[PDB]
Scaffold this active site. Structure first.
Site: not given
Ligand SMILES: [Cl-]
Ligand SMILES: [Cl-]
Length: 129
Positions: A35, A46, A48, A50, A52, A59, A101
């Site tokens: 990562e 990203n 969209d 967003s 990271d 994110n 989650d």
């Protein structure tokens, strides 16, 4: 801070990640390698809009607030900048919320694609932990 492999394993082991939700330490080190290349300051934008953040590339559209991801959630109650600290505590605490989650470590694309189903214990081999 750019961690060494064993340095990070020890740090993660000393933030409770070894076998957290069933994921052995090597999984976490492997995910961090691919990562962020063990760099706590890594950021990546990203499509969209967003971003990271940090050694586990957490994110901003769900997990942290960076003031520039409209309609995002801050499920971790941290500024995303906290995730860039040389102290990985905030990243680890947020990662624990993510992995809990329901989707496990599949939330980390690099983990699914480069760690999952590989010999991840190799990432901590030689480390004294
Ligand atoms: Cl392991
Ligand atoms: Cl799981």
């Amino acid at each position: 801070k750019v961690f060494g492999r064993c340095e990070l394993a020890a740090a993660m082991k000393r933030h409770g990640l070894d076998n957290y939700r069933g994921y052995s330490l090597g999984n976490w080190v492997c995910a961090a390698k691919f990562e962020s290349n063990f760099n706590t300051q890594a950021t990546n934008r990203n499509t969209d809009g967003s971003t990271d953040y940090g050694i586990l590339q957490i994110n901003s559209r769900w997990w942290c607030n960076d003031g520039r991801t409209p309609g995002s959630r801050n499920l971790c109650n941290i500024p995303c900048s906290a995730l860039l600290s040389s102290d990985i505590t905030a990243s680890v605490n947020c990662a624990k919320k993510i992995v809990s989650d329901g989707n496990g470590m599949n939330a980390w694309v690099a983990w699914r694609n480069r760690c999952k189903g590989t010999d991840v214990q190799a990432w901590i081999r030689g480390c004294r932990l």
